[PDB]
Ligand binder design. Structure first.
Ligand SMILES: CC(C)[N@+]1(C)[C@@H]2CC[C@H]1C[C@@H](OC(=O)[C@@H](CO)c1ccccc1)C2
Ligand SMILES: CC(C)[N@+]1(C)[C@@H]2CC[C@H]1C[C@@H](OC(=O)[C@@H](CO)c1ccccc1)C2
Ligand SMILES: CC(C)[N@+]1(C)[C@@H]2CC[C@H]1C[C@@H](OC(=O)[C@@H](CO)c1ccccc1)C2
Ligand SMILES: C[N+](C)(C)CCO
Ligand SMILES: C[N+](C)(C)CCO
Ligand SMILES: C[N+](C)(C)CCO
Ligand SMILES: C[N+](C)(C)CCO
Ligand SMILES: C[N+](C)(C)CCO
Ligand SMILES: C[N+](C)(C)CCO
Length: 311
């Protein structure tokens, strides 16, 4: 809603001058939106800026005070004429790189030979987070790359690929909130259910979040690394108890013979039994290793070839 001034070309830059002053920051002029930075140089192309609309970085001129405000920064796209692209859905645009962002009108720079589909929110900023398209979920980076004492916002809004953690993010990551892991394939499609990645199995369920710990899937129990999510197999000591997982990863219950040795996995919980235990009337004795005692004596007690306590 800025009127009364005029655009001016000087020193290879463009400004908007009203009553002798240069427009700074965000301005809505004659049906279009522009951004003039801190000193008035109209911007063009890709820009990572403080969000507009609060009034703290809007309708301002360089002769006015720039009160201190804390505003999140987001990616916006401006035409070569400086007009903000007021997209709220999506649009194919030159990819943003280290060579075509933060430029101002008058500067010379190359146009990305590569175009990409960028998604936008209802306030014309590049969208981040989850998006659903043509039957699949895609994740647009909420964060840029951290270096130690360094941050690059370029990845924000780009389609994520591979292992990706979904943090709660605003200006910074919210460490108190949960951050599930997801896996996006080569085209960015979010994987669901069982998937073998880098030689190991992971379970992403229906929501796509990587499962950890014990997980009940289609009538069977599986154990995924409590931290890394990879499916375990074979004998596993969990919670001070032994469990046997088949090569398929499914937990075994009942009698199980490993080589010549029998073991008994608790009917429901699946934990390996030790000591004397009864099964369908019969009594059996398992050593501390869980191995069933057979054709021998156990503290004055005889047990036959099936480990059954002989009367
Ligand atoms: C390259 C930009 C900064 N312009 C110099 C172009 C397009 C906007 C600005 C000034 C001029 O265009 C306008 O004055 C009209 C065009 O509709 C306009 C200005 C600002 C917002 C919306 C429209 C020519
Ligand atoms: C906790 C899960 C989601 N990981 C972070 C663990 C195990 C899988 C995932 C990523 C990583 O596992 C990997 O195999 C590493 C090896 O460099 C990896 C990271 C990103 C892409 C491919 C492999 C560490
Ligand atoms: C004759 C068998 C079936 N017992 C009754 C004997 C030997 C095993 C079984 C129970 C008991 O032997 C035990 O070791 C005791 C020890 O508390 C036991 C009782 C209940 C379950 C498991 C062991 C006495
Ligand atoms: C959804 N896209 C932008 C991510 C990829 C093309 O299928
Ligand atoms: C993939 N998501 C949209 C489904 C779920 C994360 O909240
Ligand atoms: C975990 N699965 C993919 C490996 C096997 C189901 O039987
Ligand atoms: C495998 N268990 C320990 C997880 C569950 C049985 O109810
Ligand atoms: C894991 N153990 C103690 C259970 C069995 C021998 O392999
Ligand atoms: C150990 N067994 C003989 C007892 C039972 C499995 O069939």
């Amino acid at each position: 809603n800025t009127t009364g001034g005029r655009f001016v070309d000087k020193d290879n830059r463009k400004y908007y001058v009203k009553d002798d002053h240069k427009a700074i920051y965000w301005h809505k002029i004659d049906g279009k939106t522009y951004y003039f930075g801190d000193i008035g140089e109209m911007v063009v192309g890709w820009q990572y800026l403080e969000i507009p609309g609060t009034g703290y970085r809007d309708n301002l001129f360089d002769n006015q005070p720039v009160n201190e405000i804390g505003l999140q920064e987001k990616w916006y796209y401006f035409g070569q004429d400086g007009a903000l692209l007021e997209q709220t859905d999506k649009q194919v645009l030159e990819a943003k790189t280290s060579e075509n962002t933060g430029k101002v009108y008058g500067e010379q720079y190359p146009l990305s030979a590569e175009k990409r589909t960028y998604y936008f929110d209802n306030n014309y900023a590049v969208k981040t987070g989850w998006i659903y398209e043509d039957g699949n979920w895609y994740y647009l980076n909420k964060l840029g790359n951290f270096g130690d004492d360094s941050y690059n916002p370029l990845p924000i809004g780009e389609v994520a690929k591979g292992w990706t953690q979904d943090f709660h993010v605003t200006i910074d990551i919210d460490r108190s909130k949960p951050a599930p892991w997801y896996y996006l394939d080569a085209s960015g499609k979010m994987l669901t259910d069982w998937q073998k990645v880098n030689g190991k199995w992971y379970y992403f369920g229906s929501s796509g979040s990587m499962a950890t710990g014990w997980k009940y899937v289609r009538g069977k129990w599986y154990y995924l690394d409590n931290k890394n999510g990879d499916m375990k197999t074979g004998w596993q000591y969990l919670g001070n108890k032994w469990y046997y997982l088949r090569s398929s990863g499914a937990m075994v219950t009942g009698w199980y013979q490993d080589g010549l040795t029998w073991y008994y996995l608790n009917a429901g919980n699946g934990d390996m039994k030790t000591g004397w235990f009864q099964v369908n009337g019969k009594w059996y004795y398992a050593y501390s290793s869980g191995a069933l005692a057979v054709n021998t004596t156990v503290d004055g007690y005889s047990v036959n070839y099936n480990g059954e306590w002989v009367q």
